[PDB]
Amino acid sequence: GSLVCVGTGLQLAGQISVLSRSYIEHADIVFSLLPDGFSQRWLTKLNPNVINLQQFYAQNGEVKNRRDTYEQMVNAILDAVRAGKKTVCALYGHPGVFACVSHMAITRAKAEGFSAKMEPGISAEACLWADLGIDPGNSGHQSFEASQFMFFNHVPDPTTHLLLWQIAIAGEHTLTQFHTSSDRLQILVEQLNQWYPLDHEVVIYEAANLPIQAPRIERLPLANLPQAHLMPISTLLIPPAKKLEYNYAILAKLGIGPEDLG
Amino acid sequence: GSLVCVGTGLQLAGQISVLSRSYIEHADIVFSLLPDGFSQRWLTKLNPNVINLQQFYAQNGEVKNRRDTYEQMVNAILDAVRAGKKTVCALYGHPGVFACVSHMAITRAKAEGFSAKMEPGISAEACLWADLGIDPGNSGHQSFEASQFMFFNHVPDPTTHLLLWQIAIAGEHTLTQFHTSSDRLQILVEQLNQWYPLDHEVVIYEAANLPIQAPRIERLPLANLPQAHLMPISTLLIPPAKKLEYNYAILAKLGIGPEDLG
Amino acid sequence: LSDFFTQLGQDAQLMEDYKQNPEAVMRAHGLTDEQINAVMTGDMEKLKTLSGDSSYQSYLVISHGNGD
Amino acid sequence: GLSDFFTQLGQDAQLMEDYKQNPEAVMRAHGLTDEQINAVMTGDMEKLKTLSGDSSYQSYLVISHGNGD
């Protein structure tokens, strides 16, 4: 048995890499986590032996800690590998970006003596740079899980493009609900106000999943975030609040100044 | 005319999107910037009408500002679009990540009334998360261009994974040399020592371009960086210097403590 | 619907035909007036209705921010 | 022959998993010479590019800078 984790990207059918599609094609069994029924149909046509990982999420109002959901997904994948199957895990996006299940399964498979690897894919953030016409290198980039930004000590650089992922569950500390409350988002606004003014224009971004669909690109002042409509897939982009300023200390040690820059 | 910019990923032939490959196939003309001659042959077999953008880099020891190279690349692309050609720009990696030519070409094409768009691809950072088994969501992620970090004021968060791209030209202010010097990299080491100890283990990463090739994953103390062998494609990964610590301030506003986290 | 969306997503030729004339390309591939209307108004939910889904439970959160 | 094998290997998951089982057997079966195989097993990419005829393809992959506006 062996494990290969691949990503399918965000867009139906065409955003998977050529090699990643061939892995799906030739698998004994595929464990999937895909955005919708169109994507599920496409996968099933590629390889009919599919187990849908969506089944491990809380059903019908059940209280279930997402740590248990993830543990159950990893165990299901590993049960196929342990049985001797040439196993592929097909996740949306990139299988290792804001996605613990593939890293955990690869770690556990290697510890038990099996071959396991991860193929890169196109993430929501890769889609954002394209759709918004922004280069993360322009003034640099920072990414955090929104709840981690609230629960732990993180300090953003306000010259960079800042991304808060999983904004729809910001501050949802139990890992048992699917969305947060407006009061939690208000606290996040107050926290960000250490670096960003309340009227600072931010962007709610959602990558499209169908070829006929435009991405969501909603611009609004930071103050209005707690009233906005958010979905689990939403990401909050916070553009720079200041422009790049010259680092005179280092320029001197280098023996140059601004006027010397090419 | 029209313009679509695509990426080809880092690995030969297999890391391009299904859709992006289709765009190359059906183009009237392709402008390429690819890692090697194997990749160039693969492209030429896909579509024989190729112009190689590599020609616009300084040749034979010429002194040329890279801003002029990039202008010349943008102008070549636009001349095909202005003539009426269905034009594709095929760059390695992701065409808009640490890559200015495509964003500039798309801005210019739209301003002159032509249809232009960017298709996301797999970047070197996407390859790093897969190859190192790191999730940027684990403790967060920051990316900066190394020279920008030296020349302007950026402040890293030492709980995150920090990436300095283009480390091989760190401090090269003229934009006319292909590599920096040992003394510049010593200054970077001294700068980073504000946040990271000199014996802090850092990683030099290079994504593989051929399927028979292993990525470069070189671990070394930060102090040894100025003696390391670096290539234009090298990235410096600086793992966290500190563990995550609880944000008691925000937990208190949310009415919870650490013991309440799921 | 599903066959059309799968082809369109992979085939740059059809994608460029579609972007030139969305309604013509959709009619040629048999989409109904109601489906086309749902596309033109951005109503992804109704599209999934018309495809017949049983509203496929699709939560796609694969990480958390609580550490450990 | 080199370039043909690498293009196939990079796209085809069946050949990739064969290759990873037995790299030397798969390279021999696709005709690579002993010196090519040696170059692969020692990680010498420059020699592979010599042996392919690519010699002096000028590849500089920097498409951005840190100097601002």
Residue numbers in the entry:
A (entry chain C), B (entry chain A): 2 to 263
C (entry chain D): 4 to 71
D (entry chain B): 3 to 71
Give excerpts from the publication:
Here we report the discovery of type IV borosin natural product pathways (termed ‘split borosins’), featuring an iteratively acting α-N-methyltransferase and separate precursor peptide substrate from the metal-respiring bacterium Shewanella oneidensis. The α-N-methyltransferase SonM from Shewanella oneidensis MR-1 iteratively methylates its substrate SonA at two residues, SonA-L63 and SonA-I65, in an N-to-C terminal fashion on the core peptide. Complexes of SonM and SonA form dimers of heterodimers. A five helical bundle at the N-terminus of SonA, now referred to as the borosin binding domain (BBD; 1–53), serves as the SonA leader peptide and is homologous to a portion of the fused clasp region of OphMA.
While we were unable to obtain crystals of SonM or SonA individually, we were successful in determining a series of structures of SonM in complex with SonA, either bound or unbound with the methyl-donating cofactor S-adenosylmethionine (SAM) or its product S-adenosylhomocysteine (SAH). While SAH is bound to the protein by an extensive network of interactions, the apo structure reveals the presence of water molecules filling the cofactor’s cavity. Most differences between the structures relate to concerted rotamer changes due to steric hindrance upon SAH binding. Specifically, upon SAH binding, the side chain of SonM-Y93 relocates by 1 Å and the side chain of SonM-I234 rotates nearly 180° to increase the cofactor binding pocket volume. Interestingly, changes in SonM-Y93 conformation induces a conformation change (up to 1.8 Å) of the side chain of i−2 SonA-MLE63. These changes appear necessary to sterically allow for cofactor exchange. We therefore find that SonM can adopt a closed conformation in the absence of the core peptide and with cofactor (SAM) bound, and also in the absence of cofactor with the core peptide bound.
